[PDB]
Design a protein around this ligand. Structure first.
Ligand SMILES: Nc1nc2c(ncn2[C@@H]2O[C@H](COP(=O)(O)OP(=O)(O)OP(=O)(O)O)[C@@H](O)[C@H]2O)c(=O)[nH]1
Ligand SMILES: Nc1nc2c(ncn2[C@@H]2O[C@H](COP(=O)(O)OP(=O)(O)OP(=O)(O)O)[C@@H](O)[C@H]2O)c(=O)[nH]1
Ligand SMILES: Nc1nc2c(ncn2[C@@H]2O[C@H](COP(=O)(O)OP(=O)(O)O)[C@@H](O)[C@H]2O)c(=O)[nH]1
Ligand SMILES: [Mg+2]
Ligand SMILES: [Mg+2]
Lengths: 430, 376, 50, 440, 434
């Protein structure tokens, strides 16, 4: 019916994907061993979206972890829920791409793609009807940012009708850890805009601020980013695995999030982020929820929405409420904030409500929106990409791998093509 | 970390029910930070990272223990190396602690005195030894005088049987006993078991093992490693309810204190034995509690997390409702309204109530039977 | 040089730096996402005025 | 699985290998015999030792290092040393007669005798290893063996394994102090070798080490052992990501692609922090921002140069120990918010961050205190041009009189190659000038 | 949080730092090792905690002759301070501002600037640089002058409090000192927010007349200097009813940019024998604050008019008795205020009483007070100094040392003109518009 496979590429995708399979498995009460150890019946009804039944009641994740370096597998195999995975889903090579997009996309990737494609073919056939595909990768690496786009490129040709979604991690100029990071990004975004139904841009730096200010953790680690995205990752799919007062799924959003096929980039949000001190003075209500979604100290992207007008807004709410105010505050936030929403689309907001709360919490919500703020994140990329390219800097590996100079000129044209018509969609009259 | 300092290791065993094969693993512990590791043996991989496991402590590192590591009930079967044997377990030893039938009422005080002296109880059961089993104990006394008197006293009451593990346990457990003649013991020092409650040399409280060779003989007589339990349980399945002293209360050394608070309440203690049941037996017992309470698996986890003691509470006194003596399930509401309940005197977090007791009156015999007929 | 510091305080093997206890995996923010009111009710029931 | 082979050449290479393999055996827990401690043969699921050692039938682990020299003494002291049984007696390769500071001697006459033996031994070690990552070649530009034999060995190694990565650690003649006077000739002549047949070079001068250990370590009278411990610490910081696990694992290919802008520019500068004795770390609290500043102090560089006179093209950070990515981002933001540190117009992002869990160890009887956090810095900057400028000056003042040329000629080397190598080095300098040119 | 760095220069600076830091560790409870056995992080203004819990001060002793700093290295607090806080130069200026400002200082300028850089990087939100020197010593003049010149552009806004020993009008332990004192004044004019000119002679008179000590030493005066700086900084160090930061008293003590020269006073300075039978109260100590025989600068404020007053009580003091005292002080014809300040007073309240070092001179007294008086009665000492400098300079004696060092000769005349203009400005302030 509605089944999702969880592709997993690169070191950034692996840790996020691994910590994700942690998060849901408590929501379904599945042990490290892998048997059913929940309480309620609803906690075990729709595991078939992410889990495949095995003999004796064992449940296995539906995921394929891919990396050019086998060390990240060893980092994944041996964690808390490390061994739950399929012993043959790990497909890996002996040399890494070294953050080099071309080596992952062309040189070394061409040999590992076939072994990955058979495994996903087996898992695609294993379930009767697939709703979509799911894959996490950073845009500043070489394995996930590289071969992963090749994996998406092939798989659309195989399965065109299904949903392809990715949680791409976008590099931030303020804190950057790769000298060739924009080069990999500008080569990757062109792969994305051609082939993806939806995309969420996640920036580490926005999580760095959220950890520092909203939650006020003294020493956050890289588990903070992974856990916060994983909870967001589970929120967008709760209305699938679980019944709600108002139902939705990925395609329900997908039809309603994408006004034109080129615009599929979104900013994620999660409402109940409060520091341990702040818990003492807070009566759990929905008015402060919508307050906590819409203040943009909550965005996980690095683009302020006050600069860019909101096109389409969606907020999926998790927990048992009534809705007369979630329609009122819907209407309330739209009317008085007139200037920040597009005019040719009134009733800019779309909602989903799922009756089942998260573990450890009463109310929860996940916010996704399409806005003109994201155009600031692309035109900043051209600001450093052009700096390296005008001097042909750091070129000799990509040139030495066998491709030409044209591929960079085409990517920037399409990158500039996107923002120019995006700028047009900012400046249009109703 | 730095892969340095104390890094002791044991040999783990896990019964994988799906594969239906016993698998042996490399168990690793780092006492400096309390962290845990585990690696595959045959596949030459790493089973489990260096993550801390506060649920696993240095007190749990010994052979024949059922620890719970990431929901894997692990039995440690062998010292993983030489250097773990030299530091952790060179001189810790296991010795029998029988309590003769005179002092069975004083058990809850003596078990407290056992816990204060650092001993750790591993096997626990009350027994009724036959005459032939009694003669097997006193084989060393067959030539020696008063053989019949020594036999006649010992098979005249429900003998208590314990096994205590500690460093230098054989010497300390004999030292805690004091002189065998109870009259001599009071003159020597009242701070012994045979002096506080003992009356005469024949009716001293305990007659623990003396040497290693003597110890190994008697330990198999009571607690057979072969599984052929010799002395039958003293469990009269009549007008009774069962009480489980939960593992969290065991580790904090309240085992004797809970036993004291039952005996003075004029409740008959017909039967008491320790069972280190696994999760599957926990699910069968708590099968009725599945679904009604919103924390079934948390309630499941605590019983199999450590050692628990099941007690058959005989129904007596003009007021017999042991159900109310335990009191409200949450200790906090117990503390707020009815502090005289055990779940307020020995209260803790909501799950960590002092004991578990039967709720429906009909389920008393069934839960007694499941714990003292099939599991026994 | 031998500065001849206090014998019972200075040495070479003692670690001299600021301990910042930070834990890489999901525990801290897992308990942070665990709202405390659910933690208090899992601890037990609470009581207010008539 | 990652393995990297050490190819130490000359006395510098041999002593560096002594210090480095001592550090590695201490890091992994191997006694001088070459075993596990028997009573605590814990080991387990981690074969982090695999990148430097290899098992045998007897449960013993041999380093993947070849020490090659043309004079017996330097290796004979190892064969009589405490690590005599650590190494295989055929791994230690010696010549009857050395080159004696003569490039033509170590490159055309004496080296060719043992070329085949060295090639066979590296072939055997590569056969033992399964997935090879690279060669670590250690030498100096001064000594005749350490220049000529390294040159020819790498010349044949390139055609043997064109694609395997080749990291080159070498000791530059210092600007003022020197142990040789014929050395600039050899240093000029090996420029072609280190330019055409390498992927990354890590030139170090002794005099900066002198300055640093007398500045911070308070050793008024240090020695080559004190240099070698520091250099081995650099190598350990580079290879610890391969050895153990980390939050942001970075391999040799990763730092390669993030240090080298152009095929002719593969000369980054190494930097370590904190290099401090225990007395000084007592009162200073060390943290990530301040150690990062220590990485960018020009008086803490291994090279006698001022990077403020030039512009950075790339920087690689290797943080190790108890480190947090949040203070990492705070430190990099603080560094970027400065004007003294310049960056070229074509690297507004100019860093490659690696993060590692375990802190470095220290050896007993060393100079470095044990601290919870450390950092290595690899800066590809254009300020290194002046070192080869002074080298060209010095070479030219020799070459106007053809001093010491008769030795090379009698050895049998055609004289024009001196001028040819000068033209190549001059072209390299002009390429660095083009790098420094910014299109504003 | 709040923090001040101490930058003692010269022998006077290093000895003042010795006394002040002894008093600080005894005040907070620091053992000589540096380890702790109102306010919680009250040490955080002067200490940067290690990972072990030890506490390191925030000071850099700077000197151009190691013999002194060397006694500190051989002192008990070798376990307290850190050696690269203790910076020494090979050859001293030898009472030569020329040598201290142009020749020998430039060798160590970069090193000391880097050490202040690292300490200010340890500092998060900085409050103050407190610096100490003398107007007689060559190093304490020249090196301090160039250091302040650099610090002006390296910390534009940061408050840089300046404490200096002035040449006493009668007793002079140097003969070349008026030249250095004339020259140094340009730096304390153009590069300081507040300066604390104090001569030794008045301190000697006060400690003789009140403390009954017939034979004092530099330790005796230095303890009082440490007490003064302790009283100044205790409002920042611990909570008070009315806290007083540095910015407040700078705001409220300097009328014009050219005018930043207050006079310090502290009361009571009394031995225990004299203090048993004396009941002390706020009115008495306030009256003692204004007696001209207890002023630590050899001038009579009755010869001038006050423009500003900074009262700093400490101990068991109450705002109503403060207001009573301020009423009695304002109701007096002898004390004269300028016509353009009818309100001229700052009161700081502080909870804890001043501590007493063992082997000191001051008795443990439940209440004490400090005075920062900005009056026009201070130009007369510079008038004496200019007369001495003129009777020097009419002969061009000792000029040859500075000239052979290599400073231009007309800077002497330029500095004399600057001092003359400063005194004329103070006369303009003293003029009343009635
Ligand atoms: N860092 C460091 N450099 C060394 C050491 N030993 C020698 N060198 C350098 O090596 C250069 C000379 O080469 P050597 O390694 O001594 O000898 P070689 O490489 O065998 O060359 P030949 O002696 O001519 O055979 C000198 O200029 C030194 O700078 C050492 O222990 N540490
Ligand atoms: N009150 C007081 N004054 C001091 C002290 N030490 C030095 N002085 C004064 O400082 C002046 C001379 O300067 P010094 O401190 O001795 O040394 P300097 O300032 O570095 O100048 P040079 O001697 O040239 O190096 C003398 O006139 C003293 O009055 C002290 O401990 N207490
Ligand atoms: N959110 C998140 N990001 C990560 C994690 N680990 C690494 N990253 C990011 O991934 C980037 C490095 O990607 P890389 O490993 O080169 O990607 P690959 O080439 O596909 O393997 C870094 O800039 C990190 O910010 C993680 O656990 N969580
Ligand atoms: Mg040699
Ligand atoms: Mg002096």
């Amino acid at each position: 019916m509605r089944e999702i496979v969880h592709l997993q590429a690169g070191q950034c995708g692996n840790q996020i994907g691994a910590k994700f399979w942690e998060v849901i498995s408590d929501e379904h009460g599945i042990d490290p061993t892998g048997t059913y150890h929940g309480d309620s019946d609803l906690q075990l009804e729709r595991i078939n979206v992410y889990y495949n039944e095995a003999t004796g009641g064992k449940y296995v994740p539906r995921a394929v972890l891919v990396d050019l370096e086998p060390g990240t597998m060893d980092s994944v195999r041996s964690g808390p829920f490390g061994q739950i995975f399929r012993p043959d889903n790990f497909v890996f090579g002996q040399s890494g791409a070294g953050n080099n997009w071309a080596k992952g996309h062309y040189t070394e990737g061409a040999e590992l793609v076939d072994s990955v494609l058979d495994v996903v073919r087996k898992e695609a056939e294993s379930c009767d009807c697939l709703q979509g595909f799911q894959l996490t990768h950073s845009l500043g690496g070489g394995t996930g940012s590289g071969m992963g786009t090749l994996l998406i490129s092939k798989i659309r040709e195989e399965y065109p009708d299904r949903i392809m979604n990715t949680f791409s991690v976008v590099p931030s100029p303020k804190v950057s850890d790769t000298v060739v990071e924009p080069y990999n990004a500008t080569l990757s975004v062109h792969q994305l805009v051609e082939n993806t139904d939806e995309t969420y841009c996640i920036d580490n730096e926005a999580l760095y601020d959220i950890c520092f200010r909203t939650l006020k953790l003294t020493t956050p680690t890289y588990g903070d980013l992974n856990h916060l995205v994983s909870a967001t990752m589970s929120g967008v799919t709760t209305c699938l695995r679980f019944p709600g007062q108002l139902n939705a799924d990925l395609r329900k959003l997908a039809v309603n999030m994408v006004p034109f096929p080129r615009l599929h980039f979104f900013m994620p949000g999660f409402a109940p982020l409060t520091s341990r001190g702040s818990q003492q003075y807070r009566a759990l209500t929905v008015p402060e929820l919508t307050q906590q979604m819409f203040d943009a100290k909550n965005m996980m992207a690095a683009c302020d929405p006050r600069h860019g007008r909101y096109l389409t807004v969606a907020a999926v709410f998790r927990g048992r409420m009534s809705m007369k105010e979630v329609d009122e505050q819907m209407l309330n936030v739209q009317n008085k904030n007139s200037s920040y929403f597009v005019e040719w689309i009134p009733n800019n907001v779309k909602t989903a409500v799922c009756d089942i709360p998260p573990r450890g919490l009463k109310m929860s919500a996940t916010f996704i929106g399409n806005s003109t703020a994201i155009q600031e994140l692309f035109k900043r990329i051209s600001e450093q990409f052009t700096a390296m390219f005008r001097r042909k800097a750091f070129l000799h590996w990509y040139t030495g791998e066998g491709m030409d100079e044209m591929e960079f000129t085409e990517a920037e044209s399409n990158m500039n093509d996107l923002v120019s018509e995006y700028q047009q969609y900012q400046d249009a009259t109703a | 970390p730095k892969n340095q300092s104390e890094r002791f290791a044991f040999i783990a065993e896990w019964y994988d029910p799906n594969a239906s094969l016993l698998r042996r693993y490399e168990l690793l512990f780092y006492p400096v930070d309390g962290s845990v590791e585990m690696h595959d043996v045959k596949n030459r991989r790493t089973f489990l990272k260096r993550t801390k496991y506060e649920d696993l402590r240095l007190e749990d590192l010994f052979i024949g223990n059922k620890v719970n590591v990431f929901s894997r009930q692990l039995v440690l079967i062998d010292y993983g190396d030489q250097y773990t044997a030299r530091q952790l377990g060179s001189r810790k030893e296991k010795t029998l602690a029988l309590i003769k039938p005179d002092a069975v009422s004083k058990a809850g005080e003596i078990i407290e005195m056992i816990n204060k002296s650092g001993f750790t109880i591993t096997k626990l059961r009350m027994m009724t030894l036959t005459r032939k089993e009694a003669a097997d104990f006193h084989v060393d006394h067959h030539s020696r005088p008063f053989y019949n008197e020594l036999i006649q006293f010992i098979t005249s009451g429900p003998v208590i049987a314990m096994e205590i593990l500690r460093d230098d346990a054989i010497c300390e457990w004999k030292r805690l006993l004091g002189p065998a003649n109870s009259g001599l013991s009071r003159t020597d020092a009242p701070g012994s078991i045979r002096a506080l409650f003992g009356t005469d040399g024949v009716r001293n409280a305990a007659h623990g093992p003396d040497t290693f060779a003597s110890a190994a003989r008697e330990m198999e007589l009571f607690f057979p490693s072969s599984g052929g339990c010799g002395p039958a349980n003293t469990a009269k399945f009549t007008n009774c309810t069962c009480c489980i002293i939960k593992p969290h209360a065991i580790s904090e050394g309240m085992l004797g204190k809970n036993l004291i608070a039952i005996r003075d309440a004029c409740f008959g203690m017909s039967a008491i034995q320790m069972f280190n049941l696994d999760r599957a037996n926990v699910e069968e017992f708590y099968e009725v509690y599945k679904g009604v309470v919103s924390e079934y698996n948390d309630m499941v986890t605590e019983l199999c997390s450590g050692p628990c003691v099941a007690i058959e509470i005989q129904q007596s006194n003009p007021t017999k409702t042991f159900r109310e003596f335990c009191g409200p399930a949450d200790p906090e509401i117990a503390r707020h309204l009815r502090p005289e309940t055990l779940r307020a005197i020995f209260g803790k977090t909501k799950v960590q109530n002092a004991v578990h007791c039967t709720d429906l009156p009909e389920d008393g015999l069934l839960e007694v039977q499941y714990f003292f007929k099939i599991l026994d | 040089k031998n500065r001849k510091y206090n014998p019972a305080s200075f040495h070479r093997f003692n670690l001299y730096g600021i301990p910042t206890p930070h834990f890489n995996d999901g525990r801290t923010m897992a308990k942070a996402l665990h709202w405390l009111h659910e933690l208090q009710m899992e601890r037990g029931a609470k009581i207010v005025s008539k | 699985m990652r393995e990297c082979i050490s190819i130490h050449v000359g006395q510098a290479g041999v002593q560096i290998g002594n210090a480095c393999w001592e550090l590695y055996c201490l890091e992994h827990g191997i006694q001088p015999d070459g075993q596990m401690p028997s009573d605590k043969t814990i080991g387990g699921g981690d074969d982090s030792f695999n990148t430097f050692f290899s098992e045998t039938g007897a449960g013993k682990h041999v380093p993947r290092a070849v020490f090659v020299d043309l004079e017996p003494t330097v290796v004979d002291e190892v064969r009589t040393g405490t690590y005599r049984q650590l190494f295989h007696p055929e791994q230690l390769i010696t010549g009857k007669e050395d080159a004696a500071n003569n490039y033509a001697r170590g490159h055309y006459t004496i080296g060719k005798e043992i070329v085949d033996l060295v090639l066979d031994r590296i072939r055997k070690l590569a056969d033992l290893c399964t997935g090879l990552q690279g060669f670590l070649i250690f030498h100096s530009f001064g000594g005749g063996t350490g220049s000529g034999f390294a040159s020819l060995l790498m010349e044949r190694l390139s055609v043997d394994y064109g694609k395997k990565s080749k990291l080159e650690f070498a000791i530059y003649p210092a600007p003022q102090v020197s142990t040789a006077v014929v050395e600039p000739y050899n240093s000029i002549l090996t420029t072609h070798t280190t330019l055409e047949h390498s992927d990354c070079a890590f030139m170090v001068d002794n005099e900066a080490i002198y300055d640093i250990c007398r500045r911070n370590l308070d050793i008024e009278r240090p020695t080559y052992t004190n240099l070698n411990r520091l250099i081995g610490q650099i190598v350990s910081s580079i290879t610890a990501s391969l050895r153990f696990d980390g939050a942001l694992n970075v391999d040799l290919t990763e730092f390669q692609t993030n240090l080298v802008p152009y095929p002719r520019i593969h000369f980054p500068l190494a930097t370590y922090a904190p290099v401090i004795s225990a007395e000084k770390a007592y009162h200073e609290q060390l943290s990530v921002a301040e150690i990062t500043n220590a990485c960018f102090e020009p008086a803490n560089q291994m090279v006698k140069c001022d990077p403020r006179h030039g512009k950075y093209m790339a920087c690689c950070m290797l943080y190790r120990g108890d480190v947090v990515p949040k203070d990492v981002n705070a430190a990099i933001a603080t560094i970027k918010t400065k004007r003294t540190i310049q960056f070229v117009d074509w690297c507004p992002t100019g860093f490659k961050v690696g993060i590692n869990y375990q802190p470095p160890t220290v050896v007993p009887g060393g100079d470095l205190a044990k601290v919870q956090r450390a950092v290595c810095m690899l800066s590809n900057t254009t300020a290194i041009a002046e070192a080869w400028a002074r080298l060209d000056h010095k070479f030219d003042l020799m070459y106007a009189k053809r001093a010491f040329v008769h030795w090379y000629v009698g050895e049998g080397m055609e004289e024009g190659e001196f001028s040819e190598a000068r033209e190549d080095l001059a072209a390299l300098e002009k390429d660095y000038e083009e790098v420094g040119v910014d299109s504003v």
